[PDB]
Amino acid sequence: DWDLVQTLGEVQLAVNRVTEEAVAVKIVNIKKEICINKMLNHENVVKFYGHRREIQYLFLEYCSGGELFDRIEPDIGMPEPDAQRFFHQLMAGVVYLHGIGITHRDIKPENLLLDERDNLKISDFGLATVFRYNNRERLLNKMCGTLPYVAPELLKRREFHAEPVDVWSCGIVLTAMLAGELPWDQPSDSCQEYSDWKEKKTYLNPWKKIDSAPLALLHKILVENPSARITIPDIKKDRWYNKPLK
Numbered sequence: 001d002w003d004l005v006q007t008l009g010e011v012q013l014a015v016n017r018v019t020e021e022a023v024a025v026k027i028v029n030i031k032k033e034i035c036i037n038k039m040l041n042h043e044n045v046v047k048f049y050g051h052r053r054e055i056q057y058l059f060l061e062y063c064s065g066g067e068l069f070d071r072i073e074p075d076i077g078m079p080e081p082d083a084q085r086f087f088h089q090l091m092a093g094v095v096y097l098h099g100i101g102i103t104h105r106d107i108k109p110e111n112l113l114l115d116e117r118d119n120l121k122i123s124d125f126g127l128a129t130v131f132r133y134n135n136r137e138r139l140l141n142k143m144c145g146t147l148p149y150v151a152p153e154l155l156k157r158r159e160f161h162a163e164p165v166d167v168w169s170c171g172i173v174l175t176a177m178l179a180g181e182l183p184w185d186q187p188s189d190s191c192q193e194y195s196d197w198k199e200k201k202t203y204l205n206p207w208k209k210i211d212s213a214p215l216a217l218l219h220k221i222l223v224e225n226p227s228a229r230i231t232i233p234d235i236k237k238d239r240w241y242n243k244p245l246k
């Protein structure tokens, strides 16, 4: 038996009556979240233990470290070495997902959990979907995600590639980690902060608070044209991405 100890997000912390093991139980599209979870097995992805239908119950990893969101100090961010480490682990998780043809679609600090060792884990696959199957890519056309984190093509195009969208959102997460703020309400031309970035006014916040090395990476990630946007394999060759830090 598991005792429901407290509400995490519904989602509640459950604790094993015998072993005292802790798990997160999700109490409830749900069919796809379960299916997708069944496919997942990676150290930077929230573990899926199983499910039960009574109201549906999902048994997920308890990440006692909390949400990445709470490691970001407003207007400050966090130490660059910690940001880099979290970004490495995020890429590892995203790489894995894309490798098996899954796109998360809602990457943001609220959905990035930390275990007891502060290892990052991608959470919440309620919006995730298959973008590659039998080695054939399917373009996406449904709008979803979270405005400050979504790529501009999603607002501007009828169809778009899945992967560059996840890459973009990772770029926004990195920005948040290094500056403790989001660069814009949304990646649209009616958005002054977004226009300023497109005009490379990096003497303005949040870019001003970001060292030139990571900023160079951001210049490559937050590129409006998804076809010109840096890919993960190339992120792996980026100077800052490879810089020894602490």
Ligand SMILES: C[C@H](CN(C)C)Oc1nc(Nc2cc3cccc(Cl)c3cn2)cnc1C#N
Binding pocket: 008, 009, 011, 024, 026, 046, 060, 061, 062, 063, 064, 065, 066, 067, 110, 111, 112, 113, 123, 124, 125
């Ligand atoms: C509760 C989050 C809300 N999302 C928006 C991230 O959704 C999930 N949380 C999980 N674990 C978890 C969440 C915690 C939340 C707060 C604090 C602590 Cl210690 C937590 C420890 N572990 C696992 N899967 C999902 C899913 N889906």
